[PDB]
RNA sequence: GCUGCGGUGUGGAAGGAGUGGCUGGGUUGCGCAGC
């Protein structure tokens, strides 16, 4: 699960 | 691979989910949780 570590909103990119 | 919670702050005590985010911590960092 190598992919978006944390959700909701604009959270967790880059 | 995806998604939820201003829940976290060398401001987080007078705010939000980025209609401030090329103005910073931050190519949205950090924590927790779900598929
Ligand atoms: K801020
Ligand atoms: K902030
Ligand atoms: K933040």
Do not use: L, T
């Not at 699960?1 to 880059?14: E, I």
């Amino acid at each position: 699960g190598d992919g978006r570590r944390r959700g909701g909103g604009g959270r967790g990119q880059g």
